[PDB]
């Protein structure tokens, strides 16, 4: 029986993930079920809280990435790290990062709303998502759109306390400890193709 088989079959893993995100909860994302995979925590920006950001900083690499559509990154006039122009100080606190992220992901945002450089790291998702490119950036934005949420999400790599990166079993264990659905990009590909999801 596969590693993630206890989280259910691929379709179930995706559906549980989408439901968690709709409820404002986070998920864990892997390339596939290979046991040597590293994994990220994902939160929806729509419901992002200071406490969630704080957990990321505590538990992950701390290099927290903001995954955006091409259109939203264009709207911000991004090519580079970013900082909210207003409402923050050193930019690095969990509240400051959330402010910066909320500011950047805002569909009514203007480029001047952000300063550059900063302490939040935006990534552009490829058009087509995981069906075009199997990256965690694509997986993040796809999950938001499939969940019917603001098409922006935050990711950060889960880190073991000794500083090595969490691999699949540690990610599974973390998901169980925090009631976070675990799923894979492979899961998402099977799901999108099966349910004809052009996003």
Query: Which residues, 6 or more positions from 143, have their beta carbon under 8 angstroms from its beta carbon?
Result: 17, 18, 21, 27, 29, 42, 44, 153, 188
The one among 5, 19, 23, 51 contacting its own copies by CB under 8 A: 51
The one among 58, 86, 176, 178 contacting its own copies by CB under 8 A: 58
Asked if 47 is part of the footprint of its own copies (rule: CB under 8 A), the reply reads no
Q: Are 84 and 96 in contact (CB under 8 A)?
A: yes
Q: Are 199 and 142 in contact (CB under 8 A)?
A: yes
Distances (CA, A) of 25 to 16, 67, 128, 132: 11, 17, 25, 26
CA 37 to chain centre: 16
For the window 61-100, what string marks contact with its own copies as x by the rule CB under 8 A?
xxxx---------------xx--------x-xxxx-----
Nearest distance from residue 197's CB to its own copies, in Å? 29
Asked if 147 is part of the footprint of its own copies (rule: CB under 8 A), the reply reads no
Judge whether 40 is annotated as a binding position. yes
Asked if 60 is part of the footprint of its own copies (rule: CB under 8 A), the reply reads yes
Asked if 177 is part of the footprint of its own copies (rule: CB under 8 A), the reply reads no
Judge whether 26 is annotated as a binding position. no
Judge whether 157 is annotated as a binding position. yes
Query: Which residues, 6 or more positions from 136, have their beta carbon under 8 angstroms from its beta carbon?
Result: 29, 31, 40, 67, 155, 185
Q: Which residues bind its own copies (CB under 8 A)?
A: 38, 50-51, 53-54, 57-58, 60-64, 80-81, 90, 92-95, 116-117, 119, 157, 159, 161-165
Annotated binding site for Mg(2+): 36, 136
């Amino acid at each position: 029986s596969s590693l993630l088989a206890e989280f259910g079959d691929p379709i179930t893993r995706v559906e549980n993930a989408l439901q968690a995100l709709r409820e404002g909860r986070g998920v864990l994302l892997l390339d596939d079920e290979d046991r040597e995979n590293e994994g990220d925590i994902i939160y929806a920006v729509e419901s992002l809280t200071t406490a969630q950001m704080a957990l990321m900083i505590r538990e992950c690499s701390g290099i927290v990435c903001l995954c955006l559509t091409e259109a939203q990154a264009d709207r911000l006039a991004l090519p580079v790290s970013i900082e909210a122009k207003h409402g923050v100080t050193t930019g690095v606190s969990a509240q400051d990062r959330v402010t910066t992220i909320k500011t950047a992901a805002n569909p009514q945002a203007k480029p001047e709303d952000l300063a550059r450089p900063g302490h939040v790291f935006p990534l552009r998702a490829r058009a087509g998502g995981v069906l075009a490119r199997r990256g965690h950036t694509e997986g993040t934005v796809d999950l938001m759109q499939m969940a019917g949420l603001q098409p922006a999400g935050v990711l950060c790599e889960l880190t073991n306390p000794d500083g090595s990166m969490a691999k699949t079993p540690e990610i599974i264990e973390f998901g169980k400890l925090h009631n976070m659905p675990v799923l894979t990009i492979e899961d998402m590909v099977q799901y999108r193709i099966q349910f004809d999801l052009k996003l």
